[PDB]
Amino acid sequence: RVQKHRIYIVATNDRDLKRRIRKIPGVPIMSVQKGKYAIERLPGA
Amino acid sequence: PSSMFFEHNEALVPPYNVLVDTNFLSRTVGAKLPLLESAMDCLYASVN
Amino acid sequence: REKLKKELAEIEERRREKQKKEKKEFWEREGKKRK
Amino acid sequence: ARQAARSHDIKEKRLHVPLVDRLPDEPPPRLVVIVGPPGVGKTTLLKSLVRRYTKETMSDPVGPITVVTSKKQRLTFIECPNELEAMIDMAKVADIVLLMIDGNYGFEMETMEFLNILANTGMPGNVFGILTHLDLFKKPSALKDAKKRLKHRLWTELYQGAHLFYLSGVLNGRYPDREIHNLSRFLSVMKNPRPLVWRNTHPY
Amino acid sequence: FGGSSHAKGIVLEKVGVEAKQPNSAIRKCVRVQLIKNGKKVTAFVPNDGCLNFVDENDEVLLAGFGRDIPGVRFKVVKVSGVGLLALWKEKKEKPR
Amino acid sequence: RPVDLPAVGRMRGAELRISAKEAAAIAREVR
Amino acid sequence: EAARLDSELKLVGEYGLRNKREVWRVLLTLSKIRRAARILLTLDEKDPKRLFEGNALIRRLVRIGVLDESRMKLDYVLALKAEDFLERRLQTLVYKLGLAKSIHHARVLIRQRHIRVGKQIVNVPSFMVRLDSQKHIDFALTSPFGGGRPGRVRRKKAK
RNA sequence: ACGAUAGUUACCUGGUUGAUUCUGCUAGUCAUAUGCUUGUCUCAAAUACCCAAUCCCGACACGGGGAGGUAGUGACAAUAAAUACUGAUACAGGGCUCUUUCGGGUCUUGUAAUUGGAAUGAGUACAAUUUAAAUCCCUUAACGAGGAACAAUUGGAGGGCAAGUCUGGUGCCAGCAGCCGCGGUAAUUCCAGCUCCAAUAGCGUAUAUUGCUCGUAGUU
RNA sequence: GUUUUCAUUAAUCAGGAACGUAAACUAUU
C-alpha cells in the first residue's frame, strides 16, 4: 500500500517492519515510546 | 512519484493519513493511551 | 561504477565489523548464562 | 556532582611542572622593561613612573632605575632603546614587561617582534599592554573601536584577557597622575617570578 | 583518570622517535607523566609533523581519544598553555 | 504481556493491590 | 536525516533564505500557534473559553494574513504551515509584487534600503507583512528607482 | 404421521519432517574544562563623569550632599542580518541519475571565456542636534566595490603527484606514506585557486552523562 | 457419624521454645 501510493504515516512498533519501511524514501514512522507517541521521519513536526 | 523532492514527501500535509499496525494498536491499548487523541497530540494536527 | 563498488566494499567492511561486535556481545552474554 | 566536576577541573588547572625557584631571601629588584616602537614615549612613561614612586623629576633618565615600591620588594625600570640588539639582549632579562602600543597608528613590527622574541626565549610572569597616544583622536566612537581591536589583537598575541591600560594625555609633559596611579596599582603588588630554567641556572 | 575531563602532564620521553614510517602510531605516541597522580601514561600527538612542538619536560594538557596501537587512551590537546592544533596551524608561538 | 491489565498497581487473581505511593501519585497528578 | 535536509533545502531555495536558523525559527512559531489550536480543540464546542479564544486566534491569523479569509475553522488553523508563513514574509512579497527580478534581488533591495512598507523604509527582509499593509510596498523616495538623486554609479559615470 | 423403543446412531485421521520463496542484518544538558573564529545592530549574566533632573541640610533664592542619574567593557546568553544583484555575446557537448551496473533512465548544461549595466552599507565624515559637558540615537552635505579584494569560519570524508624516502618478497608487485626532488628563493606561477557533506558569525573536542512444630510483638 | 454443646474464640509469623560418613545425572483445573 505504501509503495504504491505513499501518502501515509505508518504507525508500527516492530523493528522488522520499521527497517523494512525505512528503505523507501518519504514515509514517516509513528511508534509509541512509553509516555506518548514519537514520529520518526516527518520534517514538519 | 509526484510530490517527492529527494526523499522529502510533499504529499503529506494535514489531515494526516496514518496506517495502524497490530503491534502499535496492541501497545497503545496496553499503555492506557487513547489512539486518536495521542496521535493528534503527537503530530499537532488532525489525523484520519 | 568503480567508485560505487569501492563505497559498497567499505559499507560491507563496516557490516562485517558490526556483525563481529554483536556476535561477541551476544556470546559474552550467553556464556555467562551457561556458567 | 557538578561542584565536584568543577573542583576537579580547577585542581587540574592549578598544576605545572615542578621547576626550581632559586630566589633568595633578600631578593634583587625585579626588572621592568619599557618596550615599544620609536616615538611612542617610553622615556615619558619612565619619567612619570619615577615621579609617581620617588617624587624626583628626572629631566633625562637613562640606565636602570631602582625604586623601592614596598617594604619587601623593589623594582628597576629599564627603557629598551629602539635597536634590535638591545631588545634581544633584554628579552632574556626582563622580569615584567610594559609593552607600548601607539594608539591610533595601531600595532607595529617592533612590538610584534619583541612579543615573539620574548615568547621564544622565555615567557615572564607579567606583560602589560600600555596603549598611548589616545588624545590624537577626533571621534570617540573610533576611539573605542580602536581600543577594542587593539585589545583583541593583543589578546590573540600573548594570552586571552590581559591587562591593557589606556594612557590618554600629556598634561605637564609627563602623564596623567590617576592613569599612572592605577598602572602602578597593577605593577606594585607582585607575585614571585616564573621559574625560568635559564635564569635559574645561569648567573646574570 | 581522576574526576576531571583533562589532565596535565610532563613529557618524559617521546617514545618511538626513531621509528621509520612517518605517520606510525608508535611515531605519534608520547610517554607523559601525570601531575596529579604521578603515573606515566601514553598519549597520541595528532600528527607526525605536530610531534616537533612537543619538547621534553613541557606541561601538557591531555584529553580522551574517542573514536595501530589500539588502547592508548589519551591525546595531547595543549602544550605549555597553547593549543597544539593552533601551534600546528601556525597561529601561535610556544612560550618556553 | 496482557493488554487488559491496568497500570496502577499489581494484580493477583481478582485482587488489585495499590501501594500508598501510587494513590498519592494520582492525587499529585490531579493537583 | 535526509528528509529534514531536503525539506529545509526546499524551503531555503524556494524562498531565498540565508540558513536553516530562519526555517527553524518559523517552525518554532508555527508549532506554538498550532499547539494553541490543539489545546483549544481539546475542549468541547460552545465552551466560552474555546469560543472566545479560538475567535481571537482566528481573527489574529486572518488579520496578519496567513490564514485565508475563506476558511476560518480551528481545524484549518491546525492545517497551517511554514510555506504560508514564509509566503507572508516581506522578501517574497517584494518578489511577488515584482519590484525585484528574483528573491535574492529582493533581499538585496530590502537590505540596501530601497523599498518601504507604508511610510518608513524597512531594513529587514523577514518583516512579517500583514494583509492590510501588503498593498503599500513600494520604492522609497530617496531611492533612485523612486526618485531624488540618480545615485552612485550614475554620479561617478556622469561626472 | 413411517420411526433407531438398549443413542455402540460411538471409535475407526491430531497431523512427524524437509524443501523453496518473501522479510530483518543512537540524540539533548541552566554542564564543567578547553581549541579555532568574530565585520554590523539592539540587548546584558558578570582606580570613568556630574549634582544637570527627583530628594535632603543649613543665618539661608547662591552654600553643601557617596541617594540618584550619565558613560565604558561583554560570543555567558538573547535579537535583527551584510560578505553581492542582473543582463547580452562567444565557444563547447555533454550534464545528471539508479533497483538490478560491462546494464538501464532523463534532456539543455557548463566555462579561470569576452563584455555591459546598475544598487551600495561597513568605513571615512563637514556640520547641526542630544547632553551638566560629552557619547549613543534621530537628522545629514561630501567621499566610499571588481577579487591580486572592504580578504568567513569551524569540522568531517575522498581523489590526484616525483630521476624523493622507508618496509616486505620465489623480477615490473604491494604497503606505509610523501612541506624533504637535479638545479634554483626574485627562483618559481604550479590540482592555479582538488572534489564532496554539515553548521554558518558561529563551530569543534574531552569527561560526566541523560530440619519440622508450637508460639509473642506485628499484620489481615 | 450424631437426634452434640461456648459463639469469635480465628489466620500469619519479629523474639523465643520442643523434638534431629554424606553428595554424585536430575477460586477452580
Ligand SMILES: Nc1nc2c(ncn2[C@@H]2O[C@H](COP(=O)(O)OP(=O)(O)OP(=O)(O)O)[C@@H](O)[C@H]2O)c(=O)[nH]1
Ligand atoms: N598626544 C600625546 N602625545 C604623546 C603621548 N605620549 C608621548 N607623546 C609625545 O610624543 C613624544 C615622544 O617622546 P618620548 O615618549 O620620549 O619618545 P620615546 O620613544 O619614549 O623616546 P625615544 O625612544 O628616545 O624616542 C613626546 O614629545 C611626547 O610629548 C600621548 O599619549 N599623547
Ligand SMILES: [Mg+2]
Ligand atoms: Mg627611552
